[PDB]
C-alpha cells in the first residue's frame with residue numbers, strides 16, 4: 601500500500617504545517633501537525649476541557665463505530681517550546697492520504713496548554729519519530745508509520761515541505777518526480793528516539809564550506825533551524841544589524857535586510873536554504889525588527905534541523921531494519 605497527502609502551511613510564515621487525517625467510522629477529518637520529532641498521535645476531542653478549545657475541529661469517539669477505549673491508558677507530553685497536552689486513549693481507524701491503519705492509538709486530549717488553544721489551525725499532532733518515545737502508559741503505543749510499515753510497498757515516508765506553499769507527505773514510495781539530482785542517504789542513530797544524523801558541515805551565503813560534524817535531528821515539528829552557537833554566530837555576522845536579543849529570545853535582524861543563504865552538508869552533497877526561508881517576519885506587528893530562522897541550540901541540548909532546513913529538501917525517512925535518512929535538492 602501507499603498513501604499521499606498534501607501538507608499546508610498554517611500561516612504566511614510557515615510556522616507549522618497541517619495535513620488532513622481521517623479518524624474513525626464514519627471518517628472525522630482533523631488537520632494534524634506531522635511531527636518527525638515526537639511519537640504521539642493526539643487530537644483535540646469531545647473530552648478536551650471546553651475552555652481550552654477555541655476553533656479546533658474535535659474528534660468525538662462516541663460517534664465512531666470503530667473507536668474503542670484503551671482501558672487504563674493515559675498519556676502526557678511536553679514539547680521544547682513549553683507547550684503540553686494530556687489525556688486518555690482510544691484505538692480507531694486512521695487514514696492518511698488513502699493509507700489506512702486499523703487499531704491505531706488515538707490519544708484524546710483532556711487538557712491542552714494555552715499555545716494549543718490559541719492556535720485554531722492545528723487539531724492535534726501525528727508523531728513520526730520512533731515509537732520508543734511514545735508517552736502512553738502503562739502500555740506504550742506505536743506510531744502510525746510503525747503500524748503501517750509492514751503493509752507499505754517500501755518501509756519509508758517522505759517529507760516535501762513547501763516554502764510559502766503546499767507540499768506533500770508520502771508513505772510507502774519515493775516520488776522520483778519530486779526532487780532533482782540524486783538522494784544522498786546518511787546514517788541514523790535511534791538511541792534517543794529521533795531521526796538523528798550527522799551533517800558534514802555548512803556554508804554561509806557564497807562562503808567556503810566548513811567541514812565539521814553537526815549531530816542533529818530531522819524534525820518536521822520544529823519550525824526553525826537550531827544549530828551550535830558558533831555556526832549561528834557565523835551566519836548572523838553576515839547580516840548588517842543582526843544581533844542576539846535576550847528580550848526577544850534569539851537572533852533578530854533588520855526587516856530591510858536581504859538574508860544570505862545557508863548550506864548544510866549531507867555526506868558529500870549540499871542542501872542550500874535560500875535566504876528568504878530564514879525570514880520569520882516582524883517580532884511584533886508593525887516592527888522593523890525581524891525574527892531569524894536560524895537560532896542557537898545552546899539551551900536545548902540537541903541540534904534541530906526543523907522546517908527551515910527540511911523545506912529546502914526532499915527528505916526520505918527510511919524505516920528499513922537499519923533506518924537511514926535521505927536528502928535531495930528539489
Ligand SMILES: c1ncc2c(n1)NCC2
Pocket residue numbers: 635637638679680681683725821822
Ligand atoms: C515541537 N514539536 C512539536 C510541537 C512543538 N514543538 N510545539 C507544539 C507541537
